[PDB]
């Protein structure tokens, strides 16, 4: 066994494109529409609950997720990838911030941590 894929699966093509990132963006394009609007005294995020079946309970599938008491997230694209990112985002808000400073991270820094996780899946083996 062992993970013998210790090399990058995303690489620069001759034209300078990173194929797997572009293809990931194509997968996002196929995904259901979600949006965000910022007001003076608040922010709103919204999306469609595209139910795969009417027998399915769409309330159990949360597309909009609480990350911290003051931060929320919504997505477009592959749901399972989102779900694990929310788990990692919630944990990293504690491990790399709340357990150090005794308070929840500001939006931009939590976003920065999420961005870092996504960057690493673009370069790691």
């Amino acid at each position: 066994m062992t993970d013998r894929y210790s090399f990058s699966l995303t690489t620069f093509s001759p034209s300078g494109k990173l194929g797997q990132i572009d293809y990931a963006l194509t997968a996002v394009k196929q995904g259901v529409t979600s949006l965000g609007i910022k007001a003076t005294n608040g922010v709103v995020i919204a999306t469609e609950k595209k139910s795969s079946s009417p027998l399915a309970m769409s309330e159990t599938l949360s597309k909009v997720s609480l990350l911290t008491p003051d931060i929320g997230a919504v997505y477009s694209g592959m749901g399972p990838d989102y779900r694990v990112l929310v788990d990692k985002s919630r944990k990293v808000a504690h491990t790399s911030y709340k357990r150090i400073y005794g308070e929840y991270p500001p939006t931009k820094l939590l976003v920065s941590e999420v961005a870092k996780i996504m960057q690493e899946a673009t370069q790691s083996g």
Partner: protein
């Protein structure tokens, strides 16, 4: 330290004194010993003060992540299990002695936890240097089917026994009431029976009393423009 926990009709109450000490010296005269693990799960700590605060924040942090992961409100038994397995792993070197109390979908709960990782169940419990003074009161006045008002009275009376009779305990009584189907109400400084009397004299000095060698402005601001 004197900390107690008391079960009642529709929930549980915990209480604590507010004196933290360094040997025989009182470091803080109004310490907050009632800590929050989750909104409706609270605990009081005795022993090594850093260990009690550190272990409640860690388990409280993991409890929050667990609550988010499972989409369920946190349970006291989960806090209990996580605390005891952590403390057991460190074999008493983490000197945390806790009374854990709270409400959850299963009901109301009251546990004690010792530094080596052992846990106990009870309707009334006491921990800390004033635990014997407090337990004497609890053993004298506790009964089954206490009301909310009776439990708060009993709990605070048990802390008072520690405050007056135990040198390790003093100052004020903090209380937190966790009732089923309700928000937990934290009652900071529920009792204040130890206010210092006015001093005989004011020790405000005349300005210029202290001898000074040098003065200077300290630059706290960043490097300036232009």
């Amino acid at each position: 330290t004197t900390i107690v926990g008391v079960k009642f009709n529709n929930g549980v109450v915990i209480a604590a004194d507010t004196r933290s000490t360094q040997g025989p010296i009182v470091a803080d005269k109004n310490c907050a010993k009632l800590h929050r693990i989750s909104p409706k799960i609270w605990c009081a700590g005795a022993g090594t003060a850093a260990d009690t605060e550190a272990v409640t924040q860690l388990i409280g942090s993991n409890i929050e992540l667990h609550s988010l992961y499972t989409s369920r409100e946190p349970r006291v038994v989960s806090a209990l299990q996580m605390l005891k397995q952590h403390l057991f792993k460190y074999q008493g070197h983490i000197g945390a002695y806790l009374i854990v109390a709270g409400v959850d979908p299963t009901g109301s709960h009251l546990f004690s936890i010792h530094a080596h990782g052992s846990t106990d169940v009870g309707y009334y419990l006491s921990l800390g240097s004033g635990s014997l003074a407090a337990m004497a009161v609890l053993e004298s006045h506790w009964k089954q089917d206490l009301t909310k008002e009776e439990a708060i009275k009993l709990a605070s009376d048990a802390i008072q026994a520690g405050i007056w009779n135990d040198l390790g305990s003093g100052s004020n009584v903090d209380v937190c009431v966790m009732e089923i189907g309700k928000d937990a109400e934290y009652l900071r400084n529920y009792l204040t029976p130890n206010v210092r009397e006015e001093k005989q004299k004011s020790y405000k000095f005349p300005r210029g009393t202290t001898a000074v060698l040098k003065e200077s402005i300290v630059n706290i601001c960043d490097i300036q423009e232009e």
